Protein backbone atom coordinates (compact mmCIF):
# COMPACT_ATOMS: atom_id res chain seq x y z
CA UNK A 1 0.00 0.00 0.00
CA UNK A 2 3.00 2.29 0.83
CA UNK A 3 1.93 4.47 3.81
CA UNK A 4 4.29 5.45 6.67
CA UNK A 5 2.05 7.42 9.07
CA UNK A 6 -0.99 5.19 8.44
CA UNK A 7 -1.59 4.97 12.19
CA UNK A 8 -1.30 8.76 12.63
CA UNK A 9 -3.43 9.20 9.55
CA UNK A 10 -6.09 6.82 10.84
CA UNK A 11 -6.42 8.71 14.11
CA UNK A 12 -6.98 11.98 12.23
CA UNK A 13 -9.30 10.12 9.85
CA UNK A 14 -11.44 8.96 12.78
CA UNK A 15 -11.15 12.48 14.16
CA UNK A 16 -12.38 14.39 11.09
CA UNK A 17 -14.84 11.74 9.93
CA UNK A 18 -16.37 10.80 13.30
CA UNK A 19 -16.34 13.92 15.47
CA UNK A 20 -15.52 16.87 13.25
CA UNK A 21 -18.02 15.81 10.53
CA UNK A 22 -21.11 15.14 12.70
CA UNK A 23 -20.57 18.08 15.03
CA UNK A 24 -19.49 20.82 12.58
CA UNK A 25 -19.17 19.65 8.96
CA UNK A 26 -22.56 18.05 8.24
CA UNK A 27 -24.18 20.79 10.41
CA UNK A 28 -22.99 23.66 8.22
CA UNK A 29 -23.36 21.82 4.91
CA UNK A 30 -26.99 20.88 5.60
CA UNK A 31 -27.57 24.48 6.74
CA UNK A 32 -25.85 25.56 3.52
CA UNK A 33 -27.94 23.47 1.13
CA UNK A 34 -31.09 24.41 3.04
CA UNK A 35 -30.83 28.18 3.40
CA UNK A 36 -28.90 29.57 0.40
CA UNK A 37 -30.78 29.57 -2.91
CA UNK A 38 -29.27 27.55 -5.73
CA UNK A 39 -28.28 30.42 -8.14
CA UNK A 40 -25.95 31.60 -5.37
CA UNK A 41 -24.29 28.21 -4.85
CA UNK A 42 -23.19 27.82 -8.47
CA UNK A 43 -22.81 31.59 -8.43
CA UNK A 44 -20.00 31.42 -5.85
CA UNK A 45 -18.43 28.20 -7.20
CA UNK A 46 -17.60 30.07 -10.36
CA UNK A 47 -16.28 33.17 -8.63
CA UNK A 48 -13.85 31.14 -6.54
CA UNK A 49 -12.68 28.79 -9.31
CA UNK A 50 -12.12 31.58 -11.84
CA UNK A 51 -9.13 32.72 -9.77
CA UNK A 52 -7.71 29.21 -10.17
CA UNK A 53 -7.95 29.43 -13.98
CA UNK A 54 -4.98 31.72 -14.76
CA UNK A 55 -2.89 29.34 -12.71
CA UNK A 56 -4.41 26.30 -14.41
CA UNK A 57 -3.49 27.97 -17.67
CA UNK A 58 0.23 28.48 -17.10
CA UNK A 59 0.51 25.06 -15.47
CA UNK A 60 -1.09 23.46 -18.56
CA UNK A 61 1.46 25.22 -20.74
CA UNK A 62 4.10 23.77 -18.40
CA UNK A 63 2.58 20.36 -18.94
CA UNK A 64 3.34 20.92 -22.62
CA UNK A 65 -0.18 20.93 -24.05
CA UNK A 66 -1.12 24.57 -24.78
CA UNK A 67 -4.52 23.69 -26.24
CA UNK A 68 -6.09 23.52 -22.81
CA UNK A 69 -3.83 26.34 -21.66
CA UNK A 70 -5.97 28.53 -23.91
CA UNK A 71 -9.17 26.81 -22.75
CA UNK A 72 -8.38 27.87 -19.19
CA UNK A 73 -7.35 31.20 -20.66
CA UNK A 74 -10.56 32.07 -22.43
CA UNK A 75 -12.67 30.70 -19.58
CA UNK A 76 -10.79 33.17 -17.41
CA UNK A 77 -10.86 36.05 -19.92
CA UNK A 78 -14.52 35.45 -20.84
CA UNK A 79 -16.05 34.80 -17.42
CA UNK A 80 -14.07 37.63 -15.81
CA UNK A 81 -15.15 40.22 -18.43
CA UNK A 82 -18.72 39.52 -19.50
CA UNK A 83 -19.42 37.43 -16.41
CA UNK A 84 -19.12 39.96 -13.59
CA UNK A 85 -15.68 38.86 -12.42
CA UNK A 86 -16.56 35.19 -12.45
CA UNK A 87 -20.04 34.85 -10.99
CA UNK A 88 -21.36 33.85 -14.44
CA UNK A 89 -20.05 30.93 -16.49
CA UNK A 90 -20.34 32.79 -19.81
CA UNK A 91 -17.67 30.61 -21.46
CA UNK A 92 -19.42 27.48 -20.19
CA UNK A 93 -22.61 28.28 -22.11
CA UNK A 94 -20.60 29.72 -25.01
CA UNK A 95 -19.06 26.41 -26.15
CA UNK A 96 -19.13 22.83 -24.78
CA UNK A 97 -15.36 22.56 -25.24
CA UNK A 98 -14.96 25.18 -22.46
CA UNK A 99 -16.58 23.08 -19.70
CA UNK A 100 -15.22 23.58 -16.17
CA UNK A 101 -13.08 21.00 -14.33
CA UNK A 102 -10.73 20.73 -11.33
CA UNK A 103 -7.75 23.04 -11.64
CA UNK A 104 -4.23 22.20 -12.75
CA UNK A 105 -1.68 23.68 -10.37
CA UNK A 106 2.05 23.32 -9.77
CA UNK A 107 1.90 20.05 -7.85
CA UNK A 108 0.34 18.58 -10.97
CA UNK A 109 3.30 19.92 -12.97
CA UNK A 110 5.82 18.30 -10.65
CA UNK A 111 3.90 15.08 -11.23
CA UNK A 112 4.10 15.50 -15.01
CA UNK A 113 7.90 15.61 -14.65
CA UNK A 114 8.00 12.59 -12.29
CA UNK A 115 8.96 14.36 -9.09
CA UNK A 116 6.73 12.35 -6.79
CA UNK A 117 4.42 13.05 -3.86
CA UNK A 118 5.91 12.24 -0.51
CA UNK A 119 4.38 10.49 2.48
CA UNK A 120 0.61 10.67 2.66
CA UNK A 121 -0.54 12.81 5.59
CA UNK A 122 -3.92 13.81 7.03
CA UNK A 123 -4.10 16.97 9.12
CA UNK A 124 -7.09 17.89 11.35
CA UNK A 125 -8.72 20.89 9.64
CA UNK A 126 -7.19 20.10 6.22
CA UNK A 127 -7.32 16.38 5.35
CA UNK A 128 -4.41 15.50 3.04
CA UNK A 129 -1.01 17.20 2.89
CA UNK A 130 1.29 15.56 0.43
CA UNK A 131 4.00 18.19 0.10
CA UNK A 132 4.54 17.77 -3.65
CA UNK A 133 0.93 18.61 -4.50
CA UNK A 134 -0.68 20.43 -1.53
CA UNK A 135 2.50 22.47 -1.24
CA UNK A 136 3.86 22.90 -4.71
CA UNK A 137 0.31 24.07 -5.43
CA UNK A 138 1.54 27.05 -3.44
CA UNK A 139 3.88 28.50 -6.05
CA UNK A 140 0.60 29.56 -7.64
CA UNK A 141 0.58 32.07 -4.74
CA UNK A 142 3.44 33.72 -6.69
CA UNK A 143 1.18 34.37 -9.66
CA UNK A 144 -0.95 36.79 -11.64
CA UNK A 145 -4.14 35.88 -9.80
CA UNK A 146 -3.63 34.29 -6.37
CA UNK A 147 -1.12 37.05 -5.53
CA UNK A 148 -3.94 39.34 -4.42
CA UNK A 149 -5.79 37.16 -1.89
CA UNK A 150 -5.24 38.31 1.66
CA UNK A 151 -4.83 35.76 4.40
CA UNK A 152 -8.52 35.86 5.18
CA UNK A 153 -9.46 35.84 1.48
CA UNK A 154 -7.59 32.62 0.70
CA UNK A 155 -8.71 31.24 4.07
CA UNK A 156 -12.23 32.22 3.03
CA UNK A 157 -11.60 30.74 -0.39
CA UNK A 158 -10.84 27.41 1.32
CA UNK A 159 -13.78 27.72 3.75
CA UNK A 160 -16.72 28.19 1.40
CA UNK A 161 -15.39 25.85 -1.27
CA UNK A 162 -15.33 23.16 1.40
CA UNK A 163 -18.87 23.91 2.59
CA UNK A 164 -19.93 23.73 -1.05
CA UNK A 165 -17.96 20.57 -1.82
CA UNK A 166 -19.47 18.92 1.28
CA UNK A 167 -22.94 20.13 0.46
CA UNK A 168 -23.30 18.19 -2.61
CA UNK A 169 -21.98 14.98 -1.04
CA UNK A 170 -24.87 14.65 1.43
CA UNK A 171 -26.40 11.58 -0.26
CA UNK A 172 -23.19 9.67 -1.11
CA UNK A 173 -22.53 9.48 2.65
CA UNK A 174 -23.87 5.93 2.51
CA UNK A 175 -21.23 4.95 -0.03
CA UNK A 176 -18.43 5.65 2.44
CA UNK A 177 -20.12 4.92 5.77
CA UNK A 178 -20.67 1.34 4.61
CA UNK A 179 -17.15 0.73 3.36
CA UNK A 180 -14.36 -1.65 4.25
CA UNK A 181 -11.53 0.63 5.34
CA UNK A 182 -13.10 4.07 4.77
CA UNK A 183 -9.56 5.27 5.32
CA UNK A 184 -8.26 3.21 2.40
CA UNK A 185 -10.99 4.39 0.02
CA UNK A 186 -10.41 8.07 0.89
CA UNK A 187 -6.66 7.57 0.59
CA UNK A 188 -6.42 5.73 -2.74
CA UNK A 189 -9.12 7.97 -4.18
CA UNK A 190 -6.77 10.91 -3.56
CA UNK A 191 -3.85 9.17 -5.28
CA UNK A 192 -5.80 8.02 -8.36
CA UNK A 193 -7.20 11.48 -9.08
CA UNK A 194 -4.10 13.43 -8.09
CA UNK A 195 -2.18 11.28 -10.56
CA UNK A 196 -4.76 11.99 -13.26
CA UNK A 197 -4.34 15.76 -12.77
CA UNK A 198 -0.60 15.27 -13.28
CA UNK A 199 -1.45 13.29 -16.46
Amino acid sequence: RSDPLEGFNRTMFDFNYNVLDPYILRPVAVAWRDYVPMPARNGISNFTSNLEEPASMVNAFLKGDPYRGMIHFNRFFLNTLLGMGGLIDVAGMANPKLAREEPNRFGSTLGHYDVGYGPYVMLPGYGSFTLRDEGGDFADTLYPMLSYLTFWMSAGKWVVEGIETRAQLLDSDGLLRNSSDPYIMVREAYFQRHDFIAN
Partner: protein, 340 residues
Protein backbone atom coordinates in the same frame (compact mmCIF):
# COMPACT_ATOMS: atom_id res chain seq x y z
CA UNK B 1 -39.56 47.77 -38.46
CA UNK B 2 -37.94 44.33 -38.67
CA UNK B 3 -35.87 44.52 -41.86
CA UNK B 4 -33.80 41.34 -41.47
CA UNK B 5 -34.23 37.94 -39.80
CA UNK B 6 -32.17 35.10 -41.21
CA UNK B 7 -30.03 32.48 -39.52
CA UNK B 8 -30.86 33.48 -35.96
CA UNK B 9 -29.82 37.13 -36.36
CA UNK B 10 -32.55 39.74 -36.56
CA UNK B 11 -32.00 43.45 -37.21
CA UNK B 12 -34.62 46.08 -36.57
CA UNK B 13 -34.17 49.51 -38.14
CA UNK B 14 -36.45 52.13 -36.56
CA UNK B 15 -36.95 55.84 -36.43
CA UNK B 16 -39.42 58.65 -36.40
CA UNK B 17 -40.13 62.00 -38.01
CA UNK B 18 -41.67 64.45 -35.58
CA UNK B 19 -43.34 67.55 -36.87
CA UNK B 20 -43.26 69.79 -33.85
CA UNK B 21 -43.90 73.44 -32.97
CA UNK B 22 -43.57 75.25 -29.62
CA UNK B 23 -45.83 78.21 -28.87
CA UNK B 24 -45.03 80.69 -26.09
CA UNK B 25 -45.34 84.39 -25.41
CA UNK B 26 -42.57 86.68 -26.66
CA UNK B 27 -39.29 85.08 -27.67
CA UNK B 28 -39.83 82.06 -25.51
CA UNK B 29 -36.78 83.29 -23.60
CA UNK B 30 -38.53 83.70 -20.25
CA UNK B 31 -40.58 80.59 -21.07
CA UNK B 32 -40.65 76.94 -20.02
CA UNK B 33 -39.83 75.23 -23.30
CA UNK B 34 -39.10 78.15 -25.59
CA UNK B 35 -40.98 79.31 -28.67
CA UNK B 36 -40.48 78.19 -32.25
CA UNK B 37 -39.87 75.25 -34.55
CA UNK B 38 -38.65 72.06 -32.83
CA UNK B 39 -39.05 69.48 -35.61
CA UNK B 40 -36.66 66.53 -35.31
CA UNK B 41 -36.23 63.01 -36.59
CA UNK B 42 -34.61 59.87 -35.16
CA UNK B 43 -32.99 56.80 -36.74
CA UNK B 44 -31.70 53.67 -35.02
CA UNK B 45 -31.20 49.91 -35.08
CA UNK B 46 -31.39 47.10 -32.53
CA UNK B 47 -29.93 43.68 -33.30
CA UNK B 48 -30.34 40.33 -31.58
CA UNK B 49 -28.42 37.15 -32.41
CA UNK B 50 -29.38 33.77 -30.99
CA UNK B 51 -26.01 32.23 -30.24
CA UNK B 52 -27.51 29.13 -28.55
CA UNK B 53 -30.17 28.02 -26.05
CA UNK B 54 -28.34 29.97 -23.32
CA UNK B 55 -26.83 32.90 -25.24
CA UNK B 56 -28.09 35.98 -27.05
CA UNK B 57 -25.94 38.88 -28.23
CA UNK B 58 -27.31 42.34 -28.82
CA UNK B 59 -26.45 45.90 -29.82
CA UNK B 60 -28.28 49.16 -30.44
CA UNK B 61 -27.66 52.64 -31.80
CA UNK B 62 -29.89 55.72 -31.89
CA UNK B 63 -29.35 59.16 -33.37
CA UNK B 64 -31.08 62.50 -33.05
CA UNK B 65 -31.22 64.35 -36.38
CA UNK B 66 -32.86 67.73 -35.80
CA UNK B 67 -35.08 69.10 -38.53
CA UNK B 68 -35.37 72.62 -37.10
CA UNK B 69 -31.93 73.70 -38.33
CA UNK B 70 -31.11 75.31 -41.64
CA UNK B 71 -28.80 73.71 -44.17
CA UNK B 72 -26.28 76.47 -43.54
CA UNK B 73 -23.62 77.01 -40.90
CA UNK B 74 -25.81 75.54 -38.13
CA UNK B 75 -27.05 72.34 -39.75
CA UNK B 76 -25.58 70.14 -36.98
CA UNK B 77 -26.92 71.83 -33.81
CA UNK B 78 -28.73 69.37 -31.58
CA UNK B 79 -27.52 66.36 -33.52
CA UNK B 80 -26.32 63.62 -31.19
CA UNK B 81 -25.76 59.92 -30.75
CA UNK B 82 -28.14 58.90 -27.95
CA UNK B 83 -27.34 55.19 -27.66
CA UNK B 84 -24.42 52.91 -28.56
CA UNK B 85 -23.98 49.62 -26.71
CA UNK B 86 -23.73 45.86 -26.94
CA UNK B 87 -24.13 42.97 -24.54
CA UNK B 88 -25.29 39.42 -23.88
CA UNK B 89 -28.19 37.78 -22.10
CA UNK B 90 -27.59 34.41 -20.42
CA UNK B 91 -30.53 32.02 -19.89
CA UNK B 92 -32.02 32.72 -16.46
CA UNK B 93 -28.81 34.42 -15.30
CA UNK B 94 -29.38 37.88 -16.72
CA UNK B 95 -27.83 40.42 -19.03
CA UNK B 96 -24.54 42.30 -19.24
CA UNK B 97 -24.09 45.23 -21.61
CA UNK B 98 -21.67 48.10 -22.06
CA UNK B 99 -21.62 51.27 -24.15
CA UNK B 100 -23.55 54.52 -24.03
CA UNK B 101 -26.88 53.81 -22.31
CA UNK B 102 -29.29 54.91 -19.57
CA UNK B 103 -28.35 55.59 -15.99
CA UNK B 104 -29.93 53.21 -13.55
CA UNK B 105 -31.90 55.80 -11.60
CA UNK B 106 -33.88 56.01 -14.86
CA UNK B 107 -35.21 52.56 -13.99
CA UNK B 108 -37.31 54.57 -11.53
CA UNK B 109 -37.68 57.99 -13.21
CA UNK B 110 -39.23 56.21 -16.17
CA UNK B 111 -42.43 55.79 -14.26
CA UNK B 112 -43.25 59.45 -14.88
CA UNK B 113 -41.58 59.97 -18.28
CA UNK B 114 -44.90 59.59 -20.08
CA UNK B 115 -45.94 63.03 -21.28
CA UNK B 116 -46.70 63.42 -25.01
CA UNK B 117 -43.71 65.75 -25.44
CA UNK B 118 -42.26 66.77 -22.10
CA UNK B 119 -41.93 64.49 -19.14
CA UNK B 120 -39.54 63.76 -16.37
CA UNK B 121 -37.58 66.97 -16.13
CA UNK B 122 -35.19 64.96 -13.93
CA UNK B 123 -34.04 62.31 -16.39
CA UNK B 124 -31.30 64.75 -17.42
CA UNK B 125 -28.85 63.57 -20.05
CA UNK B 126 -25.18 62.91 -19.24
CA UNK B 127 -25.79 63.24 -15.55
CA UNK B 128 -24.51 60.19 -13.72
CA UNK B 129 -27.44 57.90 -13.06
CA UNK B 130 -30.67 59.74 -14.02
CA UNK B 131 -30.33 59.66 -17.82
CA UNK B 132 -28.42 58.47 -20.88
CA UNK B 133 -24.70 58.86 -20.32
CA UNK B 134 -21.50 57.67 -21.95
CA UNK B 135 -19.79 54.53 -20.72
CA UNK B 136 -21.93 52.41 -18.38
CA UNK B 137 -21.47 48.70 -17.82
CA UNK B 138 -24.81 47.40 -16.60
CA UNK B 139 -25.81 44.07 -15.05
CA UNK B 140 -29.58 43.43 -15.29
CA UNK B 141 -31.55 40.41 -14.10
CA UNK B 142 -35.24 39.68 -14.73
CA UNK B 143 -37.40 37.49 -12.47
CA UNK B 144 -34.54 36.83 -9.99
CA UNK B 145 -32.76 33.93 -11.71
CA UNK B 146 -36.09 32.37 -12.64
CA UNK B 147 -37.27 32.04 -9.04
CA UNK B 148 -39.12 35.15 -7.82
CA UNK B 149 -41.37 36.03 -10.76
CA UNK B 150 -41.78 39.76 -11.27
CA UNK B 151 -38.65 40.67 -9.29
CA UNK B 152 -35.99 42.52 -11.28
CA UNK B 153 -32.71 44.15 -10.26
CA UNK B 154 -29.79 45.90 -11.88
CA UNK B 155 -26.23 46.91 -11.00
CA UNK B 156 -24.29 49.45 -13.05
CA UNK B 157 -20.67 50.62 -13.01
CA UNK B 158 -20.27 54.08 -14.45
CA UNK B 159 -16.96 54.98 -15.97
CA UNK B 160 -15.37 58.37 -15.61
CA UNK B 161 -15.86 60.90 -18.40
CA UNK B 162 -13.52 63.85 -17.90
CA UNK B 163 -14.98 66.09 -20.61
CA UNK B 164 -14.32 69.73 -21.55
CA UNK B 165 -17.47 71.07 -19.86
CA UNK B 166 -18.22 70.79 -16.17
CA UNK B 167 -21.85 69.99 -16.99
CA UNK B 168 -21.08 66.86 -18.99
CA UNK B 169 -18.20 65.41 -16.95
CA UNK B 170 -18.64 62.72 -14.31
CA UNK B 171 -16.36 60.69 -12.07
CA UNK B 172 -16.20 56.95 -11.50
CA UNK B 173 -19.21 55.58 -9.66
CA UNK B 174 -21.65 52.78 -8.86
CA UNK B 175 -25.43 52.40 -8.75
CA UNK B 176 -28.32 49.99 -8.87
CA UNK B 177 -32.07 49.44 -9.07
CA UNK B 178 -34.80 47.08 -7.86
CA UNK B 179 -38.31 46.69 -9.24
CA UNK B 180 -41.25 44.52 -8.24
CA UNK B 181 -44.29 44.45 -10.50
CA UNK B 182 -47.36 42.35 -9.76
CA UNK B 183 -50.76 42.35 -11.46
CA UNK B 184 -50.81 45.93 -12.73
CA UNK B 185 -48.97 47.62 -9.87
CA UNK B 186 -45.33 48.58 -9.89
CA UNK B 187 -42.95 49.79 -7.18
CA UNK B 188 -39.30 50.67 -7.75
CA UNK B 189 -36.30 52.36 -6.22
CA UNK B 190 -32.76 53.07 -7.36
CA UNK B 191 -29.60 54.66 -5.95
CA UNK B 192 -26.30 55.82 -7.38
CA UNK B 193 -23.16 57.70 -6.45
CA UNK B 194 -19.97 58.74 -8.19
CA UNK B 195 -16.89 60.86 -7.83
CA UNK B 196 -17.02 64.45 -9.07
CA UNK B 197 -14.35 65.59 -11.48
CA UNK B 198 -12.15 68.47 -10.43
CA UNK B 199 -13.92 70.66 -12.99
CA UNK B 200 -17.24 70.02 -11.24
CA UNK B 201 -15.71 71.17 -7.93
CA UNK B 202 -14.50 74.38 -9.60
CA UNK B 203 -18.00 75.54 -10.48
CA UNK B 204 -19.45 78.21 -8.17
CA UNK B 205 -22.61 76.21 -7.57
CA UNK B 206 -22.19 72.83 -5.98
CA UNK B 207 -19.80 71.91 -3.22
CA UNK B 208 -18.95 68.29 -2.57
CA UNK B 209 -16.65 65.49 -3.59
CA UNK B 210 -19.30 62.83 -4.21
CA UNK B 211 -22.50 63.12 -6.24
CA UNK B 212 -25.63 61.16 -5.32
CA UNK B 213 -29.02 60.45 -6.89
CA UNK B 214 -31.85 58.19 -5.72
CA UNK B 215 -35.50 57.90 -6.63
CA UNK B 216 -38.62 55.82 -5.94
CA UNK B 217 -41.66 54.96 -8.00
CA UNK B 218 -45.24 53.75 -7.75
CA UNK B 219 -47.53 52.83 -10.61
CA UNK B 220 -50.79 51.23 -11.70
CA UNK B 221 -50.75 50.28 -15.37
CA UNK B 222 -53.74 48.14 -16.26
CA UNK B 223 -57.11 48.19 -17.98
CA UNK B 224 -56.85 51.62 -19.58
CA UNK B 225 -55.59 53.55 -16.57
CA UNK B 226 -51.97 54.58 -16.04
CA UNK B 227 -51.13 56.44 -12.85
CA UNK B 228 -47.58 56.95 -11.71
CA UNK B 229 -45.56 58.71 -9.05
CA UNK B 230 -41.84 59.25 -8.52
CA UNK B 231 -39.97 60.65 -5.56
CA UNK B 232 -36.24 61.16 -5.58
CA UNK B 233 -33.51 63.27 -4.08
CA UNK B 234 -30.06 64.31 -5.21
CA UNK B 235 -26.78 65.63 -3.80
CA UNK B 236 -24.27 67.89 -5.65
CA UNK B 237 -25.57 66.18 -8.89
CA UNK B 238 -28.33 68.23 -10.56
CA UNK B 239 -27.08 71.02 -12.88
CA UNK B 240 -28.24 74.60 -12.45
CA UNK B 241 -27.77 77.95 -14.10
CA UNK B 242 -28.04 81.32 -12.37
CA UNK B 243 -29.15 83.36 -15.39
CA UNK B 244 -28.37 86.60 -13.53
CA UNK B 245 -24.67 85.94 -12.85
CA UNK B 246 -24.26 83.83 -16.01
CA UNK B 247 -22.94 81.09 -13.75
CA UNK B 248 -23.43 77.35 -14.14
CA UNK B 249 -22.87 74.51 -11.72
CA UNK B 250 -24.65 71.95 -9.62
CA UNK B 251 -27.34 72.14 -6.94
CA UNK B 252 -26.09 71.12 -3.52
CA UNK B 253 -29.40 69.33 -2.85
CA UNK B 254 -32.60 68.72 -4.81
CA UNK B 255 -36.02 67.28 -3.96
CA UNK B 256 -38.20 65.95 -6.76
CA UNK B 257 -41.88 64.97 -7.02
CA UNK B 258 -43.30 63.55 -10.23
CA UNK B 259 -46.93 62.53 -10.81
CA UNK B 260 -48.65 61.37 -14.00
CA UNK B 261 -52.19 60.23 -14.63
CA UNK B 262 -53.50 59.24 -18.05
CA UNK B 263 -56.27 57.18 -19.58
CA UNK B 264 -56.24 55.47 -22.96
CA UNK B 265 -59.42 55.35 -25.01
CA UNK B 266 -60.14 52.45 -27.30
CA UNK B 267 -60.36 54.82 -30.29
CA UNK B 268 -56.82 56.06 -29.75
CA UNK B 269 -57.17 59.21 -27.69
CA UNK B 270 -54.94 59.32 -24.59
CA UNK B 271 -55.69 62.24 -22.28
CA UNK B 272 -53.00 63.14 -19.77
CA UNK B 273 -52.70 65.28 -16.65
CA UNK B 274 -49.52 65.55 -14.56
CA UNK B 275 -47.68 67.59 -11.88
CA UNK B 276 -43.92 68.07 -11.57
CA UNK B 277 -41.94 69.94 -8.89
CA UNK B 278 -38.20 69.90 -8.22
CA UNK B 279 -37.08 72.14 -5.32
CA UNK B 280 -33.43 73.04 -4.78
CA UNK B 281 -31.72 73.84 -1.49
CA UNK B 282 -28.43 75.39 -0.41
CA UNK B 283 -27.66 76.89 -3.81
CA UNK B 284 -24.70 79.15 -3.08
CA UNK B 285 -25.84 82.75 -2.94
CA UNK B 286 -29.54 81.83 -3.14
CA UNK B 287 -30.48 79.25 -0.54
CA UNK B 288 -33.76 77.63 -1.59
CA UNK B 289 -35.25 78.06 -5.07
CA UNK B 290 -37.52 75.95 -7.26
CA UNK B 291 -36.16 74.58 -10.54
CA UNK B 292 -39.28 72.93 -12.02
CA UNK B 293 -42.85 73.63 -10.92
CA UNK B 294 -45.70 73.02 -13.32
CA UNK B 295 -48.98 71.26 -14.10
CA UNK B 296 -49.43 69.36 -17.38
CA UNK B 297 -52.55 68.79 -19.46
CA UNK B 298 -52.51 67.18 -22.87
CA UNK B 299 -53.67 64.41 -25.12
CA UNK B 300 -52.42 62.12 -27.86
CA UNK B 301 -54.54 60.65 -30.61
CA UNK B 302 -53.16 57.31 -31.79
CA UNK B 303 -54.38 56.69 -35.35
CA UNK B 304 -52.48 53.40 -35.26
CA UNK B 305 -49.08 52.09 -34.22
CA UNK B 306 -47.45 54.37 -36.85
CA UNK B 307 -49.30 57.73 -36.77
CA UNK B 308 -50.17 60.05 -33.90
CA UNK B 309 -50.80 63.69 -33.00
CA UNK B 310 -50.76 65.38 -29.65
CA UNK B 311 -50.93 68.64 -27.72
CA UNK B 312 -49.03 69.27 -24.50
CA UNK B 313 -49.62 72.29 -22.26
CA UNK B 314 -47.25 73.06 -19.41
CA UNK B 315 -48.95 75.49 -17.04
CA UNK B 316 -45.77 76.92 -15.53
CA UNK B 317 -45.91 77.79 -11.83
CA UNK B 318 -42.38 79.18 -11.58
CA UNK B 319 -42.60 82.83 -10.66
CA UNK B 320 -40.83 85.78 -12.20
CA UNK B 321 -39.19 86.30 -8.80
CA UNK B 322 -37.26 83.03 -9.21
CA UNK B 323 -33.84 83.65 -7.73
CA UNK B 324 -32.02 81.48 -10.31
CA UNK B 325 -33.87 83.08 -13.20
CA UNK B 326 -35.82 79.94 -14.10
CA UNK B 327 -38.33 80.92 -16.75
CA UNK B 328 -41.88 81.64 -15.61
CA UNK B 329 -44.06 81.74 -18.76
CA UNK B 330 -46.08 78.74 -19.94
CA UNK B 331 -45.48 76.62 -23.03
CA UNK B 332 -47.47 74.39 -25.39
CA UNK B 333 -46.30 72.04 -28.10
CA UNK B 334 -48.28 70.67 -31.02
CA UNK B 335 -46.97 67.61 -32.75
CA UNK B 336 -47.61 65.18 -35.56
CA UNK B 337 -45.54 62.00 -35.48
CA UNK B 338 -44.83 59.30 -38.03
CA UNK B 339 -42.72 56.41 -36.76
CA UNK B 340 -41.78 52.99 -38.10
Amino acid sequence: AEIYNKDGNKVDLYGKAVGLHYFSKGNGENSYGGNGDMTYARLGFKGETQINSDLTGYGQWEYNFQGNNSEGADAQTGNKTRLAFAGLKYADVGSFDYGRNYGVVYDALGYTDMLPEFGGDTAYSDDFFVGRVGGVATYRNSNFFGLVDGLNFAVQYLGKNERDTARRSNGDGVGGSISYEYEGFGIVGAYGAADRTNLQEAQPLGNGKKAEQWATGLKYDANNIYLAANYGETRNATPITNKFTNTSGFANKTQDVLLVAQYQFDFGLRPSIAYTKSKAKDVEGIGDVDLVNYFEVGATYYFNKNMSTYVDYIINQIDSDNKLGVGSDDTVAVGIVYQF
